[PDB]
Ligand binder design. Structure first.
Ligand SMILES: CC(=O)N[C@H]1[C@H]([C@H](O)[C@H](O)CO)O[C@](O)(C(=O)O)C[C@@H]1O
Length: 310
């Protein structure tokens, strides 16, 4: 309580994100000798992730989560992180962020322009598509009222596969599915579990369309008033928590399809060839809109070997 800090998130109390944030908070409290306590504010209590990023910038929130892709709000070429099917796996997401000129520059800009320090990166799952009717092929997407987050890349996923997107905040999704205001949504398996979307969706299709990472971010305004030994406690704990976070997601992606089947969900495996082909005009539009910086980011990312960590 020398430093009463706050960590906001969209994810709820049953999520991997929350579990990993709990680990982070406990380690920081212990290794700071009680000087720092981090309280958690889940379920978008503080607003969504766009709002919480603004709060880090202003200094009114100390920690939050964001995807690398979310920075497309400020640097359009950063949409590359969530162009469907472009990033192959988490290894590529890691090397894109830390081992390309594009990624390194993004991290610097987040510090300089946006008032946030990137502490660590974790895996947050690969997005899949749930619905109230089976998705056996891309044909079943046509006219599907697909909820998406308020993010351009997810809206484009829905548009280009032929669905009818309805954007809304994460907090609103359960009701929309339950009432069939929409016919489906798309999120990684762990979120379908955490939010209990399986209670209100009979089908899950392995569309494998967007790879989510997760950044542990701190407000520069907060981090500057921690003496360096406490900065180190916070950084080391964020790195430890990110490895745990990733493991929770990796382990669940092995186990969760059976969990859902046990809950009465039918799992489909549509041919993804047409899904990937449908994105080609979107990639062209991305390059048009974002120009040389976008074409460069895409080339840098496509060059990455998806085999091997680092
Ligand atoms: C860090 C964070 O808040 N991630 C959230 C993401 C991103 O907001 C979105 O992918 C755009 O970047 O949206 C969800 O998946 C969603 O609303 O379905 C909830 C998830 O908790």
């Amino acid at each position: 309580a020398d430093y009463d800090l706050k960590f906001g998130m969209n994810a709820g109390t049953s999520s991997n994100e929350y579990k990993a944030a709990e680990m982070f908070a406990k380690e920081v409290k212990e290794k700071s000798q009680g000087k720092i306590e981090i309280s958690l504010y889940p379920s978008s209590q503080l607003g969504d992730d766009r709002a919480m990023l603004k709060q880090l910038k202003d200094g009114s929130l100390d920690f939050t989560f964001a995807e690398s892709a979310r920075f497309q709000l400020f640097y359009p070429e950063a949409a590359v992180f969530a162009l469907p099917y472009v990033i192959s796996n988490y290894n590529v997401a890691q090397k894109a962020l830390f081992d390309t000129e594009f990624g390194k520059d993004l991290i610097k800009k987040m510090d300089k322009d946006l008032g946030v320090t990137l502490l660590s990166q974790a895996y947050n799952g690969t997005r899949q598509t749930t619905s109230n009717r089976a998705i056996n092929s891309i044909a079943d997407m046509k006219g599907l009222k697909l909820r998406v987050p308020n993010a351009a890349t997810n809206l484009a996923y829905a548009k280009y596969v032929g669905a009818s997107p309805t954007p809304m905040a994460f907090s609103e999704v359960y009701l929309a599915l339950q009432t069939n205001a929409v016919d489906g949504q798309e999120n990684p398996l762990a979120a379908v579990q955490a939010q209990k979307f399986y209670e209100v969706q009979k089908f899950l299709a392995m569309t494998n369309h967007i790879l989510n990472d997760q950044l542990y971010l701190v407000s520069n305004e907060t981090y500057k008033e921690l003496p360096e030994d406490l900065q180190k406690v916070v950084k080391d704990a964020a790195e430890n928590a990110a490895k745990y976070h990733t493991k929770l997601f990796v382990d669940g992606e092995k186990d969760l399809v059976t969990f859902f089947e046990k809950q009465g969900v039918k799992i489909t495996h549509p041919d993804l060839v047409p899904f990937k082909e449908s994105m080609k005009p979107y990639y062209a539009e991305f390059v048009k809109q974002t120009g040389q910086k976008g074409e460069s980011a895409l080339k840098q990312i496509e060059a990455i070997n998806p085999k091997g960590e680092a």
